[PDB]
Amino acid sequence: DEVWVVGMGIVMSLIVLAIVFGNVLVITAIAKFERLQTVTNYFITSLACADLVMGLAVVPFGAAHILTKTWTFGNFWCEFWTSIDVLCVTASIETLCVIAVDRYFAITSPFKYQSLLTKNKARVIILMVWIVSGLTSFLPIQMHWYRATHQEAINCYAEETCCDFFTNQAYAIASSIVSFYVPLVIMVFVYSRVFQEAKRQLQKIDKSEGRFHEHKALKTLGIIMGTFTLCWLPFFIVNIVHVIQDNLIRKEVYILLNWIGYVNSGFNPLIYCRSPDFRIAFQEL
Amino acid sequence: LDQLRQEAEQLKNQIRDARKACADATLSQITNNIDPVGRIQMRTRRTLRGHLAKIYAMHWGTDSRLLVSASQDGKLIIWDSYTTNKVHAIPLRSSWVMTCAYAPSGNYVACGGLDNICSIYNLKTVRVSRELAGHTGYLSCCRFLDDNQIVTSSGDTTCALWDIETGQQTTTFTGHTGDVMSLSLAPDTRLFVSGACDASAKLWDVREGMCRQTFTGHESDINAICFFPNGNAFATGSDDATCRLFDLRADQELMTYSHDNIICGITSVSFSKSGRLLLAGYDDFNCNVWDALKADRAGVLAGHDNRVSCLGVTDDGMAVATGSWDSFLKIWN
Amino acid sequence: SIAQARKLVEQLKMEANIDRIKVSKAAADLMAYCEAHAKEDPLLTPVPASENPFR
Amino acid sequence: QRNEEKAQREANKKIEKQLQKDKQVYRATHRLLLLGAGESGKSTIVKQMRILHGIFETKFQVDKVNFHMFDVGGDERRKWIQCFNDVTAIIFVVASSSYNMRLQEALNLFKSIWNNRWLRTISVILFLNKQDLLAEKVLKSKIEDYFPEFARYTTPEDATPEPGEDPRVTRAKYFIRDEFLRISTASGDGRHYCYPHFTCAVDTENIRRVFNDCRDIIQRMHLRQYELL
Numbered sequence: 049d050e051v052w053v054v055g056m057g058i059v060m061s062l063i064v065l066a067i068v069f070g071n072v073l074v075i076t077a078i079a080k081f082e083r084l085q086t087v088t089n090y091f092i093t094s095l096a097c098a099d100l101v102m103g104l105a106v107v108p109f110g111a112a113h114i115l116t117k118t119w120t121f122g123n124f125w126c127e128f129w130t131s132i133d134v135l136c137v138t139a140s141i142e143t144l145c146v147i148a149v150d151r152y153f154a155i156t157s158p159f160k161y162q163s164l165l166t167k168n169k170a171r172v173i174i175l176m177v178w179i180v181s182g183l184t185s186f187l188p189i190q191m192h193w194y195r196a197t198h199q200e201a202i203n204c205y206a207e208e209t210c211c212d213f214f215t216n217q218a219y220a221i222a223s224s225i226v227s228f229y230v231p232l233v234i235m236v237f238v239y240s241r242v243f244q245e246a247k248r249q250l251q252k253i254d255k256s257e258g259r260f261h262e263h264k265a266l267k268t269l270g271i272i273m274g275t276f277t278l279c280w281l282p283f284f285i286v287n288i289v290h291v292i293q294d295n296l297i298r299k300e301v302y303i304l305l306n307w308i309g310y311v312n313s314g315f316n317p318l319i320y321c322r323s324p325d326f327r328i329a330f331q332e333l
Numbered sequence: 334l335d336q337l338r339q340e341a342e343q344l345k346n347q348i349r350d351a352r353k354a355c356a357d358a359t360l361s362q363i364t365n366n367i368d369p370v371g372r373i374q375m376r377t378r379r380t381l382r383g384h385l386a387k388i389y390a391m392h393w394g395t396d397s398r399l400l401v402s403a404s405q406d407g408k409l410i411i412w413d414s415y416t417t418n419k420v421h422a423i424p425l426r427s428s429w430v431m432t433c434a435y436a437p438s439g440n441y442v443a444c445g446g447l448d449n450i451c452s453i454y455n456l457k458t459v460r461v462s463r464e465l466a467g468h469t470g471y472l473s474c475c476r477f478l479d480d481n482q483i484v485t486s487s488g489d490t491t492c493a494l495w496d497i498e499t500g501q502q503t504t505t506f507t508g509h510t511g512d513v514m515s516l517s518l519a520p521d522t523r524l525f526v527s528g529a530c531d532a533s534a535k536l537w538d539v540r541e542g543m544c545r546q547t548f549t550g551h552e553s554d555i556n557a558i559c560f561f562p563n564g565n566a567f568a569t570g571s572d573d574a575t576c577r578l579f580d581l582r583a584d585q586e587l588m589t590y591s592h593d594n595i596i597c598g599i600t601s602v603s604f605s606k607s608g609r610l611l612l613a614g615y616d617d618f619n620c621n622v623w624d625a626l627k628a629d630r631a632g633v634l635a636g637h638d639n640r641v642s643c644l645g646v647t648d649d650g651m652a653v654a655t656g657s658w659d660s661f662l663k664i665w666n
Numbered sequence: 667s668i669a670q671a672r673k674l675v676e677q678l679k680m681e682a683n684i685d686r687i688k689v690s691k692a693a694a695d696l697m698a699y700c701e702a703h704a705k706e707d708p709l710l711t712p713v714p715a716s717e718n719p720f721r
Numbered sequence: 722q723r724n725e726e727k728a729q730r731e732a733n734k735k736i737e738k739q740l741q742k743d744k745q746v747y748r749a750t751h752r753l754l755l756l757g758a759g760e761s762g763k764s765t766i767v768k769q770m771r772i773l774h775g776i777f778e779t780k781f782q783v784d785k786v787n788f789h790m791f792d793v794g795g796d797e798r799r800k801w802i803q804c805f806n807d808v809t810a811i812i813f814v815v816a817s818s819s820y821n822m823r824l825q826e827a828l829n830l831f832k833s834i835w836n837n838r839w840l841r842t843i844s845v846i847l848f849l850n851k852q853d854l855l856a857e858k859v860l861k862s863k864i865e866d867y868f869p870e871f872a873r874y875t876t877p878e879d880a881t882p883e884p885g886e887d888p889r890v891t892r893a894k895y896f897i898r899d900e901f902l903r904i905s906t907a908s909g910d911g912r913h914y915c916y917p918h919f920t921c922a923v924d925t926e927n928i929r930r931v932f933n934d935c936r937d938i939i940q941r942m943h944l945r946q947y948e949l950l
C-alpha cells in the first residue's frame with residue numbers, strides 16, 4: 049500500500065525527467081551548431097518542441113491527478129489541460145506524417161527534390177500543421193461541443209472537485225479519424241513505396257556487380273513503423289470501442305493506454321536522431 | 334656529357350661545405366634566455382556570411398577597412414570588416430579561381446583561376462580592364478607591384494612580370510624543376526621569392542631577372558611562403574608537418590617548427606606585425622600559432638569544419654582573418 | 667636538352683660566390699628587431715576594449 | 722552618417738536578394754568532370770553532347786535538367802584534383818582497341834585516381850570506345866601475346882551477349898572490364914561505385930545512359946544518407 053503510493057510516484061518522476069532532458073538536448077543541438085541546420089532538420093525541431101511542451105505540461109498534471117485522486121484546481125484548468133493534451137498529441141502525429149512524406153519525396157524523385165522543398169515551403173507546411181492542430185483541439189473544447197448526454201456525465205460536470213473525460217461518439221470518431229488513421233495509411237503507403245524502390249536498387253547492384261562480392265532496410269523501416277504503431281495503435285481502437293458500446297471498458301484500461309501512449313514522445317529523438325553528426329554534436333556538449 | 338654532370342656535383346659539394354663552415358651556433362640556443370610569450374587567447378569577433386561554395390584565397394586591403402574573397406562558385410565579394418556589410422559582388426566568366434589580390438591604391442582588384450588567363454577589374458568607374466594571357470599552366474598566386482605592374486606565378490615553372498597597358502611579359506623567370514604554387518613580395522619592390530612543387534625555393538630579383546639563391550631544406554611539396562617584417566628572412570610551410578624559417582644573409586635554415594602529433598600539411602603561413610608570432614594553418618580543422626624565436630606553441634584557433642585554405646594579417650596588426658572550405662569566414666582579434 | 671645541363675653548370679657557379687655571414691649576426695638582428703618592436707604589436711599584448719574598434 | 726549607414730544597408734540588401742536568387746540556379750545544375758587518356762576519342766563523344774544544346778565548358782539540358790561539363794586539356798602528378806571534389810560523377814574514357822600501340826598506362830592512372838583522399842565520395846562513369854576496332858584485331862595481335870594474365874577470362878559467367886559476329890570477340894570484351902572492375906571493388910566502403918558501359922564509335926543513347934547513371938548515383942546517395950542500405 050505504501051509501496052503502491054511511492055513506486056507509482058518514482059516511476060512517474062523518472063518519465064517526466066528523461067523526456068525533458070532529451071528534448072532540451074535535441075533543441076539545443078539543433079539551435080547551436082550551424083552544420084546541423086538544414087531544411088530536413090527544421091521538421092525535427094517542431095516535433096521536439098511539441099513533445100517538450102507535452103512532457104512539461106500534461107504529464108506531471110496527470111500524474112498528480114492519478115496520485116491525489118482529486119483535482120484541486122478549477123474547471124477552466126481542466127479544460128485547458130485536456131485542450132493542450134489533444135493539441136500536442138495531434139501535432140506530433142501530423143509532424144511524423146509530414147516527415148515521412150518528405151522522405152518519400154526525397155527518395156523517389158531526386159531531380160525535382162531540390163526545388164520542391166525550400167525554406168519558404170517548410171515554414172508554410174509547419175504553420176499549416178500547427179494551425180490544423182489548434183483548430184482540432186481548442187475550438188471544440190473551449191466551448192461545450194464535447195459535452196456528453198449521460199446523467200453521470202452531467203453530474204460529473206456539476207461537481208467541480210473532480211473532472212474526467214466524457215464526450216459523445218461523434219467527436220471521438222472525428223478526432224480519431226483526423227489524427228490517427230489518415231496519417232497511418234499515408235505512412236504505410238509511403239514506406240511501402242520506399243522499400244520497393246530500395247529493393248529494386250539492391251537487385252540492380254547485385255545483378256551488375258555480384259560476382260566480385262536487405263536486412264538493414266528491413267530493420268530501419270521496422271523499428272520506425274513498429275514503435276509508433278505499437279505505441280499509438282491500441283489507444284485509438286479503445287477510443288472507438290468505448291464510444292460504440294456503453295459500459296464495456298474499464299477506466300483503468302483507458303488511463304493505462306493513454307499513459308503508455310505518452311511514452312512515445314520520449315523515444316522519438318532516439319529513433320529520429322541517431323545520425324553520426326548528431327552523436328558528434330551531443331558528445332561536444 | 335659525363336663531365337658536365339660531375340662539375341655540377343663538385344659545385345654543390347663546395348656550396349654545402351661553405352654553408353656548413355658558415356654555421357657557428359644553433360638558432361634555438363641563442364634565444365634560450367628569452368622570456369616566453371605565454372598563453373595567447375583570442376576569440377571570434379565577427380562572422381561573415383554570403384558565400385555559396387568553398388573559398389580559396391583572400392587579401393586584406395591596404396587600409397584596415399576592406400578585404401576581398403574568392404570562391405569556387407565564381408564570385409568576388411568585397412566585405413567591410415567593421416560593419417560586416419557587402420559592397421560589391423563581381424561574377425566571373427570562369428567558375429574556378431585560385432587566387433586574388435587587392436591593389437595598393439585600392440582602385441583595382443585582380444583574380445586568376447585554373448583557366449590560363451589573369452584578369453584585372455576596375456573598382457572606380459565594374460568591367461574587365463584588361464586580360465593578361467601567355468601562360469601554359471594554371472595560375473597559383475599573384476600580387477600587385479604597383480598600379481601598373483603585376484607579377485604572377487603559373488603551373489608551368491615560369492614566373493613572369495606583366496605591364497597592364499602593354500599586356501606583354503616584360504621579364505620571364507625560369508629555372509624551377511616543377512610547378513610553382515607560392516609567391517610573396519618583399520616590403521620593398523626589389524626582391525621576391527617563390528616556393529614550387531620541388532623542395533627548392535629560390536629568391537629572384539625583379540629588375541635583374543636572375544636567381545640569386547636556392548634553398549632546399551624541405552623534403553616534400555611547398556604550399557606557402559611569407560616574408561619576415563624586417564625583410565631579411567622568410568618562413569616556409571610544406572606538405573610535411575615541418576615548418577622551417579630560412580634566412581637570406583646566411584643561406585642555411587635556422588629553425589624548424591614541427592611536432593609529433595601533427596601529421597597534416599600546411600596550406601598558409603603568415604607573420605605578425607612585430608614578427609614574434611608565426612601563424613600557420615593546417616589541413617586539419619585547426620589553425621596553430623607558434624613563437625618564432627623559440628619554437629614554442631602559444632594557442633589553438635578552432636571553429637572551422639571543412640578546412641583552412643586562406644589566411645592574412647592586417648597591416649596595422651590588430652586583427653587576423655582565416656578562410657575555410659566552408660562558406661563562412663572568421664575574424665579574430 | 668644538353669644545354670639545360672650546360673645552363674645549370676654556370677648557374678651553380680654563379681650562386682656559390684656570395685659571401686656568407688655567420689649565424690650570430692642574423693640571429694642577433696632577428697632578436698633585436700623582435701625585442702624592439704614588441705610594444706607596437708597589438709596582438710602580443712591584449713589591447714584595451716575602448717581602443718579596440720572591432721569590439 | 723545615418724544617410725551613409727542607410728546607403729550601405731540598402732546595397733547589402735540588393736546584393737543579398739540577388740545572391741539568394743542565384744542560389745537556386747547554382748543548386749539546380751549538375752556538374753560532370755570528363756577525364757581520359759590520350760587518343761581515347763573524347764572529342765567524338767562530345768559531338769552528340771553539343772547536339773543537345775585552357776578549359777572547354779559544355780552546357781546541355783535534357784528533360785528540364787541542367788548539366789554542365791568540364792573538359793581539362795593536358796604523365797603529370799596533378800594538384801588540380803582537389804578542386805574537383807564536388808562533382809556528381811567523373812566520366813572516364815579508355816580506348817579498348819589501343820592495347821598493342823598503352824592500356825596498362827590507363828589502368829595505372831585509375832588506381833592513382835581511385836585512391837585520392839579528396840575523391841573518396843565520387844563515382845566514376847566509365848566508357849569504352851573503339852568497340853569496332855577491337856573485334857577486327859582479335860578476329861592478328863592477340864591479347865595472350867601482349868598480356869600474360871589473359872588465360873581463363875574468355876567467358877563471362879553472367880554473360881548476356883548481344884547478337885555477336887564472334888563468340889570469341891565476346892571473350893575480349895569481358896576481359897578488359899574485369900580488369901577495370903577489379904580495382905573499383907578493392908577500396909572504399911561502398912560510398913563510391915563504378916558503372917561500366919560498352920559504346921561503339923557510332924552510338925545515340927549516350928545522353929540517356931549518362932542520365933540513368935546520374936539518377937542511380939543520386940538515388941543511392943539519398944538511400945545511404947537515411948541509413949536504408
Ligand SMILES: Nc1nc2c(ncn2[C@@H]2O[C@H](COP(=O)(O)OP(=O)(O)OP(=O)(O)O)[C@@H](O)[C@H]2O)c(=O)[nH]1
Nearest residue numbers: 758759760761762763764765850851852854921922
Ligand atoms: N574506329 C574507331 N576510331 C575511333 C573511335 N574513337 C576515336 N577514333 C579515332 O581516333 C581518333 C582519336 O580520337 P579523338 O576524338 O581525336 O581524341 P582526342 O581529341 O585526340 O583526345 P585525347 O584522347 O585526349 O587525345 C579520332 O579522331 C578517330 O579517328 C572509335 O570508337 N572507333
Ligand SMILES: CN[C@@H]1CCc2c(ccc(O)c2O)[C@H]1O
Nearest residue numbers: 133134137213220223224227306
Ligand atoms: C485524455 N487524453 C485524450 C483523450 C481523447 C483523445 C486524445 C487525443 C486525440 C484525440 O482526438 C482524442 O479524442 C487523448 O490524448
